[PDB]
Design an enzyme around this catalytic site. Sequence first.
Site, short mmCIF file in Angstrom:
data_model
loop_
_atom_site.label_atom_id
_atom_site.label_comp_id
_atom_site.label_asym_id
_atom_site.label_seq_id
_atom_site.Cartn_x
_atom_site.Cartn_y
_atom_site.Cartn_z
N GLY A 1 17.26 56.01 31.88
CA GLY A 1 16.42 54.83 31.84
C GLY A 1 15.12 55.14 31.12
O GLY A 1 14.53 56.20 31.30
N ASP B 1 19.89 65.84 37.12
CA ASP B 1 19.66 65.43 38.50
C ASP B 1 20.28 66.44 39.46
O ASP B 1 21.40 66.91 39.24
CB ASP B 1 20.25 64.04 38.76
N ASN C 1 22.44 62.95 32.62
CA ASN C 1 22.43 61.63 32.00
C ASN C 1 21.82 61.78 30.62
O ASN C 1 20.64 62.13 30.49
CB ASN C 1 21.65 60.63 32.85
N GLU D 1 24.49 65.64 38.21
CA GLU D 1 24.97 65.10 36.95
C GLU D 1 23.88 65.19 35.90
O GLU D 1 22.69 65.29 36.22
CB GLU D 1 25.41 63.64 37.11
N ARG E 1 18.26 63.70 31.33
CA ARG E 1 17.71 63.85 32.67
C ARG E 1 18.75 64.54 33.53
O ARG E 1 19.85 64.02 33.74
CB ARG E 1 17.30 62.50 33.28
N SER F 1 24.49 54.28 37.30
CA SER F 1 23.72 53.39 38.17
C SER F 1 24.42 53.14 39.51
O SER F 1 24.31 52.05 40.08
CB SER F 1 23.42 52.05 37.47
N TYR G 1 17.49 49.67 40.62
CA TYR G 1 16.74 48.87 39.67
C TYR G 1 15.91 47.75 40.30
O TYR G 1 15.14 47.10 39.58
CB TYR G 1 17.70 48.26 38.63
N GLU H 1 25.87 48.62 33.12
CA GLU H 1 24.44 48.88 33.02
C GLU H 1 23.80 48.11 31.87
O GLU H 1 22.84 48.59 31.25
CB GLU H 1 24.21 50.39 32.87
N1 LIG Z 1 28.02 64.56 47.03
C1 LIG Z 1 27.01 63.71 47.35
N2 LIG Z 1 26.23 63.93 48.43
C2 LIG Z 1 25.22 63.11 48.75
N3 LIG Z 1 24.90 62.01 48.05
C3 LIG Z 1 25.60 61.67 46.94
C4 LIG Z 1 26.72 62.52 46.51
N4 LIG Z 1 27.22 61.96 45.40
C5 LIG Z 1 26.50 60.85 45.13
N5 LIG Z 1 25.53 60.67 46.05
C6 LIG Z 1 24.55 59.56 46.06
O1 LIG Z 1 24.98 58.52 45.18
C7 LIG Z 1 24.04 58.35 44.12
C8 LIG Z 1 24.75 58.13 42.80
O2 LIG Z 1 25.61 59.23 42.55
P1 LIG Z 1 25.72 59.74 41.04
O3 LIG Z 1 26.81 60.79 40.97
O4 LIG Z 1 24.32 60.02 40.54
O5 LIG Z 1 26.21 58.38 40.33
P2 LIG Z 1 25.49 57.74 39.04
O6 LIG Z 1 25.89 58.61 37.87
O7 LIG Z 1 26.07 56.35 39.01
O8 LIG Z 1 24.01 57.78 39.34
C9 LIG Z 1 23.23 59.63 44.07
O9 LIG Z 1 21.91 59.37 43.59
C10 LIG Z 1 23.24 60.10 45.50
O10 LIG Z 1 22.18 59.47 46.22
K LIG Z 2 26.23 61.00 33.61
MG LIG Z 3 24.79 58.98 36.20
MG LIG Z 4 22.79 59.45 39.28
#
Ligand SMILES: Nc1ncnc2c1ncn2[C@@H]1O[C@H](COP(=O)(O)OP(=O)(O)O)[C@@H](O)[C@H]1O
Ligand SMILES: [K+]
Ligand SMILES: [Mg+2]
Ligand SMILES: [Mg+2]
Lengths: 324, 318
Positions: free
Chosen positions: A288, A270, A284, A282, A268, A159, A229, A13
């Site tokens: 950003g 989510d 963060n 998660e 943040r 990301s 991004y 990132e």
């Molecule tokens: N269990 C899940 N069900 C549905 N979509 C998911 C799931 N896990 C991840 N995603 C999709 O992948 C994206 C990134 O996952 P995330 O865990 O937020 O990774 P990062 O920390 O890199 O953002 C999420 O914004 C979501 O759209």
């Molecule tokens: K995180």
């Molecule tokens: Mg993340």
């Molecule tokens: Mg995420």
Amino acid sequence: MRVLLIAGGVSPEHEVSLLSAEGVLRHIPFPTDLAVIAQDGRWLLGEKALTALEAKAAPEGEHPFPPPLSWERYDVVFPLLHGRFGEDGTVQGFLELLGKPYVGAGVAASALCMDKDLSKRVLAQAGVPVVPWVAVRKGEPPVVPFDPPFFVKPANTGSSVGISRVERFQDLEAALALAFRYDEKAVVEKALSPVRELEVGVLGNVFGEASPVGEVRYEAPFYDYETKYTPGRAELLIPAPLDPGTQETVQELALKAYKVLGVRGMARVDFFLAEGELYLNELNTIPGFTPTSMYPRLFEAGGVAYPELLRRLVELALTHHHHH
Amino acid sequence: RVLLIAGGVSPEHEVSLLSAEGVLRHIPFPTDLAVIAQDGRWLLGEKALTALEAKAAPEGEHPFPPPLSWERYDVVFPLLHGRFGEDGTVQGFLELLGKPYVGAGVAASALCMDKDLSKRVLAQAGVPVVPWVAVRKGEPPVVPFDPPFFVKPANTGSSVGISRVERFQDLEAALALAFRYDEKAVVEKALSPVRELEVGVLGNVFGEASPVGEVRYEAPFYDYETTPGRAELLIPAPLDPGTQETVQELALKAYKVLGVRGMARVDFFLAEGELYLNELNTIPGFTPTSMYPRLFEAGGVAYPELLRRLVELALTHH
Ligand SMILES: Nc1ncnc2c1ncn2[C@@H]1O[C@H](COP(=O)(O)OP(=O)(O)O)[C@@H](O)[C@H]1O
Ligand SMILES: [K+]
Ligand SMILES: [Mg+2]
Ligand SMILES: [Mg+2]
Ligand SMILES: Nc1ncnc2c1ncn2[C@@H]1O[C@H](COP(=O)(O)OP(=O)(O)O)[C@@H](O)[C@H]1O
Ligand SMILES: [Mg+2]
């Protein structure tokens, strides 16, 4: 009063971190110096750090760690680094040894929120709803207790780097190999489809205040790397269209997760929204931070202007170091 | 060439130098010593060896970060106990230096150092722990169980700021004492009577367990005061075979869940035939009377071979 802003980082990132520092620099209400960690792990200072900020990338640095900074020049350090070495506690650990106040979560909170397995363990133990998942470690064979579709991720990523959506068990091994290029541990989560993605900002030390709730929409099957991004490919709804009880439940769980994990400064949080089912995805700790990113715009919609948001982050760091 | 960091600003400053005396006598690699004095400043070169024979280092020469030639070392052995030692802060610095180092990484160190978060991870994983509640300063405690209690700073070492609380109305004063050392405290159900068991793990994530040892002392609890002569170590512990097996099972499982690297000493509580994991110590004592080195000695791992495998596990991970 002078702030040291550290941007870039060796994480995947890196360019995202530089974009956030440009916005922070223009509006931060404190005299601020910029340090840039180049992709090679070496530091750029003075004019060369500014030049990298215009070039929007820093492949090669000049000074190896530790850099020849006079750390007593700065009253606070703003670690604006995303991903590994940035928001996983390692830089925060160095700043702790240095005896220097810094913006954001401490060592334990940073590491915990960056680990998608261990944060889910702590969150589930506190009764915070998360997606069913299993951890997978390098070499040890995977034992997934549920059926695809899967989301396979490195345990410490950001990301959407290294994340695969797997539809059949045959595609799992390739998703594991990809994930293990970025971490020694992976998570395999049950996929939610369709899913609405909600994000809420928190501000404060341990006992934070929540922003209005926002939502991310996109055209891709999920919020992947290319979508995140590439400007305009994402869509931010502020405030999100939700029933008042749903909005309150989201702000509720975010502040509880924030408190349980001992987060400092900001985060943040989510969420996933299945139909009415809420899951915490998660946290963060270094979101950003461009003037148009979700976190600033959420508090923008909460009555906290971008320069005032930056002012309060710095003072929160001063409050915790010199009084806690 | 190995760089050995010892001392620290924690109350375990003298024990850290004492542990460095043991390592330097049996480590099979060339090792220089760098001492962190109690005032945070470092002592290097022959000046560090002077603080070692002096058994203490009150004041140091160089402020952090020290003008140390990191390029001349392949592995760093951080032999620092407690705060600014086992809590991920020193590990982060070494991660940014790019050097391989001995022991747990940033995340495992901070997690095992936090007596609240480690229990949450362990409890969710089905490892038994004592009933506990976290308490944050400025918020009134909500303790659902009855005394006696053990109140602790969430990030402590050597029982600093730890009180055995036998009356509910004494809990306010104990939280205050613990809150002078940490913003967060834990209130744990006290086990009484209780036996204290300890077991060593060696390996990256997937470790091997040592024999099980037991501490027997003559104090209200195994406090800082417990002084070579007030704590005898039973090696191995006099345990019925089923219990000794479960200790090693729970030790390796927690070691795996927390992703500990290098080493850990996993301490358990035994009360009425039930085991409870108390804490994982990622930098255990290395004095020739400490439990960790002697446990792997009884298990057939010679102290030089123990130190070689610790260094090699660091090089393998990085
Ligand atoms: N269990 C899940 N069900 C549905 N979509 C998911 C799931 N896990 C991840 N995603 C999709 O992948 C994206 C990134 O996952 P995330 O865990 O937020 O990774 P990062 O920390 O890199 O953002 C999420 O914004 C979501 O759209
Ligand atoms: K995180
Ligand atoms: Mg993340
Ligand atoms: Mg995420
Ligand atoms: N729940 C408990 N029940 C009984 N004794 C305890 C409990 N918690 C702590 N103690 C006593 O206090 C000592 C120190 O506790 P511990 O949590 O290991 O602190 P430290 O991190 O300083 O070692 C232990 O060795 C034990 O004797
Ligand atoms: Mg102990």
